[PDB]
Amino acid sequence: DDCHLPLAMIFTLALAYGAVIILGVSGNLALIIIILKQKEMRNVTNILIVNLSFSDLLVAIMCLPFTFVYTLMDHWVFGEAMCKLNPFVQCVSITVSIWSLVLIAVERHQLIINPRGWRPNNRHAYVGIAVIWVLAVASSLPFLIYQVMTDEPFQNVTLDAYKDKYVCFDQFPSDSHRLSYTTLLLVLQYFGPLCFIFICYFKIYIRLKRRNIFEMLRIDEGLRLKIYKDTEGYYTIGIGHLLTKSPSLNAAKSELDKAIGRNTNGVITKDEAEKLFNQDVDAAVRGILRNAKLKPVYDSLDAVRRAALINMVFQMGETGVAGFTNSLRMLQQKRWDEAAVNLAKSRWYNQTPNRAKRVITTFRTGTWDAYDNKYRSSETKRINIMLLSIVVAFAVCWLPLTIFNTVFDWNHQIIATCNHNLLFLLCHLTAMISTCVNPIFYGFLNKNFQRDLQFFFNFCD
Numbered sequence: 001d002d003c004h005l006p007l008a009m010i011f012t013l014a015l016a017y018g019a020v021i022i023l024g025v026s027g028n029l030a031l032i033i034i035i036l037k038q039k040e041m042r043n044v045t046n047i048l049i050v051n052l053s054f055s056d057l058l059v060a061i062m063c064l065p066f067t068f069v070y071t072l073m074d075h076w077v078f079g080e081a082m083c084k085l086n087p088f089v090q091c092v093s094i095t096v097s098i099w100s101l102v103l104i105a106v107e108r109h110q111l112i113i114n115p116r117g118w119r120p121n122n123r124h125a126y127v128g129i130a131v132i133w134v135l136a137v138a139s140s141l142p143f144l145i146y147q148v149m150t151d152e153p154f155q156n157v158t159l160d161a162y163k164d165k166y167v168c169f170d171q172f173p174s175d176s177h178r179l180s181y182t183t184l185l186l187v188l189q190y191f192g193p194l195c196f197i198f199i200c201y202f203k204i205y206i207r208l209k210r211r212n213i214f215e216m217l218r219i220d221e222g223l224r225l226k227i228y229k230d231t232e233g234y235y236t237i238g239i240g241h242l243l244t245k246s247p248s249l250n251a252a253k254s255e256l257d258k259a260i261g262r263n264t265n266g267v268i269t270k271d272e273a274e275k276l277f278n279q280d281v282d283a284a285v286r287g288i289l290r291n292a293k294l295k296p297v298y299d300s301l302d303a304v305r306r307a308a309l310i311n312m313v314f315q316m317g318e319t320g321v322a323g324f325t326n327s328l329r330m331l332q333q334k335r336w337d338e339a340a341v342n343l344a345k346s347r348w349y350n351q352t353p354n355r356a357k358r359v360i361t362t363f364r365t366g367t368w369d370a371y372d373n374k375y376r377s378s379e380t381k382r383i384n385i386m387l388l389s390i391v392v393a394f395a396v397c398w399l400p401l402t403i404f405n406t407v408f409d410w411n412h413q414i415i416a417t418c419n420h421n422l423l424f425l426l427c428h429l430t431a432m433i434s435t436c437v438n439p440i441f442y443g444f445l446n447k448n449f450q451r452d453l454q455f456f457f458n459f460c461d
């Protein structure tokens with residue numbers, strides 16, 4: 001066989017695997033214990049995170065050490081029971097994690113669409129996790145059924161006359177049966193769901209940008225649920241939405257019952273106000289793009305700075321903002337500090353300083369730091385970025401082993417060498433690291449958990 005694996009690699013790997021056990025097993029068990037006993041911190045997202053780290057506890061116990069030890073041997077010393085479970089319990093774990101991450105993305109998407117009235121009773125999450133586990137066990141079953149432990153190796157193993165040497169290998173009906181199962185598993189259970197997860201998180205980001213523009217105008221133009229007479233003298237409702245220039249209150253009430261399409265009687269809801277504000281934002285955007293002066297300036301700006309421009313259109317109008325000739329020129333040319341000086345030298349700034357000072361600070365920094373009251377928008381931005389990073393870390397971790405496994409499923413004829421076993425252990429370890437990314441991203445990036453894990457570890461002493 002001309003084979004020779006060095007002990008300089010073996011011990012370094014044993015240290016690396018042992019580190020991923022003590023960081024994984026403890027971290028995933030700490031994440032569970034904290035969320036479980038800490039009631040009210042056990043929300044739909046957190047319940048699915050406990051389910052996610054429970055599967056990562058199984059692959060760390062049932063699969064991780066047995067695969068490493070078997071690789072360094074020409075025979076399976078753990079029995080038929082541990083042999084058949086190895087690909088099954090690993091597959092179930094990848095699948096449960098995939099669907100639990102899918103469910104988290106759907107829950108986060110429902111929260112960004114409707115945060116006000118979304119009060120979910122955890123029973124739908126318990127229903128989800130049960131369906132996920134039944135779906136995972138079912139789809140993974142052929143690995144358990146077709147994994148074999150026979151003392152009849154395909155290849156020459158080292159002689160041992162006193163004991164019968166057994167080998168743990170996959171023995172599917174045929175190569176087409178194995179390859180067909182494996183390719184739709186990889187496509188429909190790995191790539192497929194992941195694509196959908198990223199689709200949701202993109203849709204979350206897009207709807208969050210439009211709701212950030214809502215919070216900006218709420219603080220400035222003001223959110224009113226009753227038909228009120230504005231500075232001009234005409235009837236308005238919500239965030240500066242004009243009904244009619246008609247002086248009759250009943251004539252103005254008729255426009256609201258037409259805009260909403262419901263018998264309002266002068267009173268509308270918080271959600272009803274956001275729906276019309278978003279329509280005005282689109283109407284303003286359409287106008288800004290129709291405006292030759294304001295179109296190159298809007299196109300130049302980022303999401304935050306475009307909102308500062310929209311806030312200005314909502315206040316002065318299109319002909320109003322167009323009058324800021326030299327200031328818009330500077331904003332177009334990305335001179336944020338120079339433009340902040342010029343926008344303060346206006347008749348707009350002197351008249352409405354409180355609003356202007358905020359709009360100017362947003363045009364200079366390019367962030368919602370001017371509107372510090374909006375800290376609720378800043379928190380869910382951090383949570384969704386962390387949750388997306390968990391998905392990417394999961395996808396990247398398993399990707400080298402997923403490639404190694406398919407490459408050798410199509411090239412099943414190829415004999416396992418010392419170079420293959422080293423490459424496999426480097427892929428297996430990277431995949432095993434996914435067990436650690438769940439508590440490290442939910443600990444060192446989550447503010448609630450980092451202080452809580454320290455007030456539990458030091459409390460034990």
Ligand SMILES: COC(=O)C1=C(C)NC(C)=C(C(=O)OC)C1c1cccc(NC(=O)NCCCN2CCC(c3cccc(OC)c3)CC2)c1
Nearest residue numbers: 087091170182186189190401402405406408416420421424
């Ligand atoms: C829903 O997503 C999934 O279910 C999976 C993903 C995403 N990610 C991994 C790592 C999987 C896994 O661990 O599932 C249990 C399965 C999966 C995917 C594709 C393909 C496969 N193929 C097989 O298991 N073939 C059966 C043959 C497996 N052999 C791979 C090579 C290995 C080996 C080991 C040492 C040296 C070698 O050199 C030739 C070869 C021996 C076992 C699995």
